[PDB]
Amino acid sequence: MSINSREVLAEKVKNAVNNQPVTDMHTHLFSPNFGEILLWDIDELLTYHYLVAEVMRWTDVSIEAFWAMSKREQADLIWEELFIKRSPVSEACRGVLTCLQGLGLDPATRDLQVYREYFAKKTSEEQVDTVLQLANVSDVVMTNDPFDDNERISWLEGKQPDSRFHAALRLDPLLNEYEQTKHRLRDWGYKVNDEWNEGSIQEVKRFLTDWIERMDPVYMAVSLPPTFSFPEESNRGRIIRDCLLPVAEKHNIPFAMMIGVKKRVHPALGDAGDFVGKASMDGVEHLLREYPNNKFLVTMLSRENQHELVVLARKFSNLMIFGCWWFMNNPEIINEMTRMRMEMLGTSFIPQHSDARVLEQLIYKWHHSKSIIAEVLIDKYDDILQAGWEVTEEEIKRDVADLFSRNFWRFVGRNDHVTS
Amino acid sequence: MSINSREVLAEKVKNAVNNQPVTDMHTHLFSPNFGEILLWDIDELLTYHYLVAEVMRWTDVSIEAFWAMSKREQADLIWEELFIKRSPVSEACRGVLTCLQGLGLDPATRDLQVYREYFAKKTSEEQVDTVLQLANVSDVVMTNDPFDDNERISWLEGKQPDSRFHAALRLDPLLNEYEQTKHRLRDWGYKVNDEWNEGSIQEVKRFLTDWIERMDPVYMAVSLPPTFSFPEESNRGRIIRDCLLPVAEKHNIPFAMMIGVKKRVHPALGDAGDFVGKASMDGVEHLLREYPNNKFLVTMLSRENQHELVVLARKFSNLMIFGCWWFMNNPEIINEMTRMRMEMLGTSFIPQHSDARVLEQLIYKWHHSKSIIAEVLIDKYDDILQAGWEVTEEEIKRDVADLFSRNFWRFVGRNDHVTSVKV
């Protein structure tokens, strides 16, 4: 019994998409046994830096006074200003409501005290079980930063993430701030020299290889500015060339590059203070061509890089593009991006990741994105259906599996939580 | 109470949008007592520069011969070329038809001579009353250029605008043509020197302050090229730093920057001769960061600048972004811009202004833009209702008021014409 109309296709696709367990291959979450660095609950949702930026456009409260408030005072203020005093129509505010609803709380009542009561009853481990189930996420990739004292501790103590959580080695401080990070590496025993000589090359490689051994990361990642260039006679250029790319190749680990972030244009806003610019594609093109035995995962921040990044993926099979990152993570842009991407790459890409910083965001990030992606799929399958092609439900489930999970694991050359 | 259908939602949003009096916070209209610089009528609509550009793509008539023609002849040619010989499907041509319809004229007859008869029967003051009612526009912000001899006369004679019309001081000749303009300032008794010294600084400030006192402007405005940078050692860079910003901070008057116009790439087209380019955001970013006690209003001309402008608005609360300017003022682009803005800023922006150069254009500019903005709001409300939120009709009316009027007045730190009459 064939799928022979758009109407039935819409049912089968929406269901296949809803039922597919997601691998979220870039997040800011942590296994619950790491302790308090895992953020969760309605106050954390309301104080997400996305909503700090937004509240500051309305409130008379100074940013100084805001940071001096408690977490609950901050959440109260953002609730009042973004939900009660104006309708919560932005993507970030909507996402808070999608989360409350998904947990079985009722946004109709606007009863924040009662929302808070739900979270006070649970342990972190319970809420992870709840959220992963509700979000239908089988596997989460963490962002693991050896230079963050608060996170390093857990690794140093012999803690392992539970099997649903995977490590990814974040290298920004090493690559973008080597002149400072130099001295931390020396204090940790990595005997880097003032000169970029064989000794410094071998000791930075050892630092990388030691952390790879300890975390077993799925990839190594870096955020890069719009002015990113390669090759480059800079600390960043030399490290990529001489240390990171050879180690990534040896271990068959992809190098993830998140390009286009301009750091701290409004420092007082903290995490809400970063900006965006369009990047040259030249450095990415060079890396792909001149390092055919390295694998690259790339996502870019500027709307204006998105089409050319898709074309670049047509050129190089060692590029996997992923996600609608940050300022790209808004319905209007997710839609145009996913359509361009599918049109020129078919199913050979990773449409989305959450970048979740608070546990419950998995619910809204995946619900909001799946609905858009489902609709793109329905359009694209219908177009071939009307061309005379038979699409089977098995084939849909396969394609959707590729998009939400298998493409990633196939590219990184490892197995998920269920397969292992 | 709460809404729970998309039927009922669409209705309530569309009615709220239609019923909300608009503040049009950037136009090229004037109070009717200013005389003939207020353009109106069907011949003015048809010879708007947007349509001169379009007709020049089709007609065998040279641009020279076109400017040699009378207004009625130009209008006649444009009607034949763009409406009769091809269907009037462009946004500008569509707009002409929306105006005629809104006035109660029937575009079905295509009877241009009959449309003309309507306008011959009325005064400027009558037509302004008619159009502001039909467009539901309560407040119009003008573009007032003290370097235009025609306009400067009225201000200097002591004419004050009708309470529905507000001043905005346009400074392009000062900031962008100082090499010529410095000599006019001198001729007006402002003792600017050849060097940029303390004397020149204080005299340019005095010019600004005299015009602020004369016009009571709601903001000071400049149009800027794609190559705009700040800081910069240039005439413009020094006037902004030394004169404009301190004067604007002292009086608490925003600085409006309309960025991305490349002037006169086709000189023979006149007003239709200007082009566009993408700007760097660096100068705007620097201004917002380093001048936190100044308020900035910004609109940009390049499609490729729109998303990063929204992000910049997320960084800086002294930034208010506004409108879909000029080449952006097209349904396809109004739609994508309004959606991005709302997704990232909620209701903390000004979605639209008209740039109306001819009075009747307020009808189409607002009717076309309101319909798109209403669609966007319905979608965003529907998304939060789907998430369990209950929207009330009063909350809708409030959101709509913010977007079409109150956001502007709150930002510029003044009252509109009705609140002024009350306060």
Place this chain on the structure above:
Amino acid sequence: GMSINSREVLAEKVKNAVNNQPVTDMHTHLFSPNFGEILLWDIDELLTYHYLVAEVMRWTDVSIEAFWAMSKREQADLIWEELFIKRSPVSEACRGVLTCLQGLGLDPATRDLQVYREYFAKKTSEEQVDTVLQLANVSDVVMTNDPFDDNERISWLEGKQPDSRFHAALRLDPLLNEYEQTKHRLRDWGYKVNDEWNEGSIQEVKRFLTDWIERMDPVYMAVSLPPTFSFPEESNRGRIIRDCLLPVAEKHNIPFAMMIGVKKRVHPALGDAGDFVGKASMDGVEHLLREYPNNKFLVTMLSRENQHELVVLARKFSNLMIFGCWWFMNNPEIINEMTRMRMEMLGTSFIPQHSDARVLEQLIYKWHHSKSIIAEVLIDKYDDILQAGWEVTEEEIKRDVADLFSRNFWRFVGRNDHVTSVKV
């Protein structure tokens, strides 16, 4: 006769007008069937279009070297298996292959690639051209004619003329972008260009242009240009354009077609599938339009990020005709946004699409896919003016549709289509 009473009735009228209108496809890589094997056709050529080579290389374990070592049939088999069977053929290029097979009466439901092949084995080139132009509703095809390609050159030198449905367009990439290498061939052909760019060099390059203009009767002369294109420029390209091409173009009243934004061979092993894109400066195009008002220019651009500003540049200059959704733009999401921006700012005074077809049958999908998108843009735009009180008539719809799909081009180039050249 009757008013258009509803959007539903509008839609059927527009879709009918669009479907019935014979297309002039003003830029293709097809040839008149009498040119011989250089006209590519059949399912194996469809499947090995370089768009699909790019896509199969993202999936398959087969090396690019091993791929090129395979026969055409083997290549087609791999591509079918990897992009149609192992994953759903949802990409625009893949979908296009299915639209083609369907259009020819070959049923994609069966996936019977061997039976599809049998269809093509039964026919001549000339029979397939008749079939495909009828099914695609294409009246007139404009070729890309390169005098430097020996494989094509031969047909011209043999005194062969294109079938009257096929029109010549003179491609000048090797002369303009590779002059220092091409000089030597010019000299072999008796064009005695000098080491210096002096009068003799100017006159001999002009003579080469004039010779080919007279041989091919081209409707325009064409070049593809990188994102770093500038004019004026003290380069071989800049000098040839200024001193030879613009003067000859003006004398003969032939437009100059520029396809801007291709970055050649960023992945050389992929061959034709190895080219990339960048955003260009508009300055060179602006300068040419302004400073050469007696020349006509046809422009299409490769970067998404140039599209809006190109439409604005058309508003400025009546000697600019913009055309098409080129290559990486030739994707429904992008065709839609482009056609909407264009019509919003230019009305009907542009050429919405061309196919760039490299394999004969692509005319079918390229025009079927594009016509559906353009029909829907037209429906939206007519509906908006009907809602403003304007009475659009069916005859006016057909007129506007004739303008967009054929007449705008023939009017701009100052020449007649095949049917009009028979009558005259």
